[PDB]
From a paper:
[name].1 is an acute phase protein that becomes strongly upregulated during inflammation. Chronic inflammatory conditions, such as tuberculosis, leprosy and rheumatoid arthritis, are risk factors for the development of systemic AA amyloidosis. We report three cryo-EM structures of [name].1-derived amyloid fibrils: one that was extracted from the diseased murine tissue and two that were formed from murine [name].1 protein in vitro. In vitro and ex vivo fibrils possess parallel cross-β sheets but differ in their overall topologies and fibril protein folds.
The second most abundant fibril morphology (morphology II) represents the majority of the remaining fibrils. Morphology II presents a left-hand twist as demonstrated by platinum side shadowing and transmission electron microscopy (TEM). Using cryo-electron microscopy (cryo-EM) we obtained the structure of morphology II, complementing our previous structure of morphology I22. The 3D map of morphology II achieved a spatial resolution of 3.5 Å, based on the 0.143 Fourier shell correlation (FSC) criterion. Morphology II is polar, C1 symmetrical and consists of three protofilaments (PFs). The PFs are referred to as PF-A, PF-B, and PF-C. The arrangement of PF-A and B in our model is relatively symmetrical and similar to morphology I. The PF-PF interface is formed in both cases by reciprocal ion pairs between residues Asp59 and Arg61. The interactions between PF-B and C also involve complementary charged residues. There are reciprocal interactions between Asp22 and Lys24, as well as a contact of Gly1 (α-amino group) from PF-C with Glu25 (side chain) in PF-B. That is, the packing between PF-B and PF-C is more asymmetrical than that of PF-A and PF-B. Alignment of the fibril proteins reveals only small, if any, conformational differences between the protein folds that construct fibril morphologies I and II.
Author numbering:
A (entry chain Q), B (entry chain N), C (entry chain K), D (entry chain H), E (entry chain E), F (entry chain B), ...: 1 to 69
The structure:
């Protein structure tokens, strides 16, 4: 099994990027969540990029190349 | 089993990047979560990049290359 | 089993990067979490980069190279 | 089993980078957590880099190279 | 078993980098945690670098090289 | 078993880098934790570097090299 | 740039399987060659086979098999 | 740049399997060659086989097999 | 740049399997070669086999097998 | 840059398996070569085998096997 | 840069397996060579085998095996 | 740069297995060579075997095995 | 190859009358050349003469004569 | 190879009359060359003469004569 | 190889009349060369003469004569 | 190899009349060369003469004569 | 190898008439060379003469004569 | 090897007429050389003469004669 959580350039309150497995006879309660923003500038940004998501990669040659300037 | 949590350039309150496994007869309670922002500048940023996520990578040659300037 | 938590350039209150395994007859309570920001500049930043996440990497040649200037 | 927690360039209150395993008949309580920021500059930053996360790396040749200028 | 906690360039209050294993009939209480910042400059920073996290590395040749200028 | 805690360039209050193992019939209480900063400059910094974390390294040749200038 | 010479189940006299390269200001003579056979039985024989000649073979998968039953 | 010479199950007299290179201001003579066979039985024989000649073979997987039953 | 000479199950007189290189101002002669066979039984024989000739072989996996039953 | 000479199950007279290099102002002669066989039984024989000739072999895995039953 | 000479199960007279290098202002002669066989039984024999010739072999894993049953 | 000479199960007269190097202003002669066999039984024999010739072998793991049952 | 370089009454910096033959895998560089001449009288002078270039001159009778005066 | 370098009444810096033969894997560099001439009289002078270049001159009778005066 | 370097009445700095043969894996450098001439009379002078370059001169009768005066 | 270096009435700094043969794995350097000439009379002078370059001169009769006066 | 270095009426600094043969794994350096000439009369002078360069001179009759006066 | 170094009427600093043969694993250095000449008359002078360079001179009759006066 493969579990991968990735996060970048974000504003959150709570409860994020959670993994629960192999459980029995459990129980849980979560809390209220409030987000309040006033007068904020130049926030929550990421620059250019690429995203690749896969299970198997086999015999990659001269690939997955990225160039900027 | 593979569990990978990654975080960069973020503003949070709580409860993030959590892994629970192999549990029995458990119980839990979480708390309220508040996020308040006023008058903030140049926040929560990441620059250019790339993301690769996979289980198996086999025989990679001259690849996964990144260039900036 | 492989568990990897990574964090960089962040502002948080609590409860982050948690791993719970192999448990029985347990119980727990968490606390409220507040985040308050006013008048803050040039915060929560990371520069250019790359992210690679995987389980197995086999026979990598002239790869996973990064260049800046 | 492999457990790896890494943190860099962050501002936190508490409860971070926690590992609990092989437990029975346990119980615990956590405390409230407050984060307050006013008038702060040039905070919570990391420069360019790369991140690699994996379980097995086999026969790596002329790879995982990083250059800056 | 392998447990590795690493921290650099951070401002915290408490409860960080904790490992609990092989426990029975235990119980514990944690305390409230407050973080307060006003008028602070050039704080919580790390320079360029790289991060590698893995379980096994086998036959690495001319790799994991980093250059700066 | 391998337990490794590393810390550099940080400002903390308490309760950090803790390892508890092989316990029975134990109990403990922790104290409140406060962090207060006003008017501080050029604090909590680390320069360029690299991080490698692993369990086994086998037959490394001309690798794990770092150069600065 | 290679020279391959393979011979099986032949009846010869001489002057066979020559590779001459990088000759300058040379000179020579080869004599005479007599072959005489009288009354021979069941000679110069080979069984079944598969013959392959090439310069470059890439990424072959589940191929070049021979079965005899 | 190599020279391979392979011979099996041959009846010869001489002057076979020569590799001459980098010769200058040379000179020579080879005599005469007589082959005479009378009344021979069951000579010069080889069984089944597979023959492969090449310069470069890359990333071969589950190939070049021979089965005899 | 190598020279390989392999011979099995041959009846010869002489002047075989020569590798001459880097010759200058040389000179020579080779005599005569007589082969005579009368009444021979069951000579010059080899069994089944697989023959491979090459210069470079890379990353071979589960290949070049021979089975005899 | 090497020279390999291998011989098995041969009936010869002489003048075989020569490697001459780096010769200057040389000179020579080789005599005559007589081969005579009468009434020989069951000579010059080899059993099954697999023959491989190469210069470079890299990262071979589970290969070059011979089975006889 | 080496010279390998291997011989098994041969009937010869002489003048075999020579390696001459770095010769200057040389000179020589080799006599005559007679081979005579009459009435010989069951000579010049070798059993099954696998033959390998190479210059460089790298990172071989679970290979070059011989089984006889 | 070495010279290896190996011989087993041969019937010879003489003039075998010579390694001459670094010769200057030399000169010589070799006589004649007679081989005579009449009525010999069951001579010049070797059993099964595996033959390997090389210059460099690196990082061999679980290989070059011989089994006889 | 015949090479006849002949020079009379000439002035140069360098790189004159060069003969390169039978070269391999060789590289070379020739620096820059300056020729400065000022205030010089009666330079680079050859008297009268005849010039002959040929390969084969057979049965020349009373020919190729130069009568001065 | 025949090389005849001949020079009379010449002025140079260097790099003249060079003959390179039978070279391999060789590299070389030739520095820069300066030739400065000022205020010089009666330089680089050769009297009268005839020039002959050939290879074969057979049965020359009363030829190739130079009568001065 | 025949090399005839001949020089008469010449002025130089260096690097003249060089013959290189039969070289391998060799590298070399030649420094820079300066030739400065000022205020000099009657330099680099050769009287009259004839020049002969050849290889074979057969049955020369009363030829190749130089009669001065 | 025949080498005839001949020099008459010449002025130099160095590096003249050099013959290199049969070299391996050798490297060398030649420093820089200066030739400064000022105020000099009657230098580098050779009287009259004839020049002969050849290899074979057969049955020369009353030839190759120089009659001065 | 025959080497004839001959020099008459010459002026130099050094590095003249050198013969290197049959060298291996050798390295060398030659320092810089200065040749300064001022105010000198009647230098580097050779009278009349003839020059002969050859290899084989057979049956010379009344030839190769120099009659002065 | 035959070496004939001959010198007449010459002026030098050093490094003249050197013959190196059959050397291995040797390294050497030659210092710098200065040649300064001022105010000198009648130097480096040789009278008339003939020059002969050869290898084989057979049946010379009344030849190679120099008649002065």
């Amino acid at each position: 099994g493969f579990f991968s959580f990735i996060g970048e350039a974000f504003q959150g309150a709570g409860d994020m990027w959670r993994a629960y497995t192999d459980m029995k006879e459990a129980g849980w309660k979560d809390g209220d969540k409030y987000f309040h923003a006033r007068g904020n500038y130049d926030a929550a940004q990421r620059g250019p990029g690429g995203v690749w998501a896969a299970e198997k990669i086999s015999d990659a040659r001269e690939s997955f190349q990225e160039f900027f300037g």
